[PDB]
Amino acid sequence: LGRTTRDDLINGNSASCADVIFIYARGSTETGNLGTLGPSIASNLESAFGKDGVWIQGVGGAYRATLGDNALPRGTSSAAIREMLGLFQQANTKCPDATLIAGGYSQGAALAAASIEDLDSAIRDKIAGTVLFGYTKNLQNRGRIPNYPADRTKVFCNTGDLVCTGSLIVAAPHLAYGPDARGPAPEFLIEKVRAVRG
């Protein structure tokens, strides 16, 4: 695999359920299914919950993270939404009691948002927290994920990252989320898991 690819949910089963399952969608053109920011969040999550206590799953399969899909209505393709929807379904079926947390960068942040929007409310209720970096629909959705609570959403949108302000121009702030994925974003997700699970 490489640190850039994590299939802990796909490869896992009910007998080895983790308490927490993190599903993450990478940006356009990023490698593996975690890209650049996903591995730092994963390392922090495993310090907090232990290697056995958290499953990290990047969104792969039909999510090709094609730069042209950014221009589609929901900011990604229908196929990609179904891929992410199916991973939340699979988490829910394999491990009905795990707490779910989610994340995404750039097109993966629009994908997370469209997926959570379309999710059955009972599964959606289980997602304790979602972190979105360089969220391409930040302006259009006014910093929110449709049908999901504000208190469970943390958007990291740098000043000068123009994708947070309605365009698809890539500027240097868009490439500057490394600090956030190492610190505030995993801390937020851990705090949201601990508030549900203890």
DSSP H helical ranges for the chain = 38-49, 78-94, 107-118, 121-124, 178-182, 184-197
Q: Respond yes or no: is residue 106 known to be catalytic.
A: yes
Q: Is 14 helix (H, G, I), strand (E, B) or coil?
A: helix
With a CB cutoff of 8 Å and minimum separation 6, the contacts of 150 are 144
Q: Are strands 127-133 and 153-156 parallel, antiparallel or unpaired?
A: parallel
Among the listed residues 40, 69, 77, 174, the single catalytic one is 174
> Are 76 and 68 a contacting pair, CB within 8 Å?
no
Among the listed residues 77, 106, 115, 180, the single catalytic one is 106
Helix %, strand %, coil % for the chain, to 5? 45, 15, 40
Residue 50 CA: distances (Å) to CA of 18, 42, 47: 10, 11, 5
Q: Respond yes or no: is residue 174 known to be catalytic.
A: yes
Among the listed residues 28, 69, 115, 161, the single catalytic one is 161
The catalytic residue positions are: 106, 161, 174
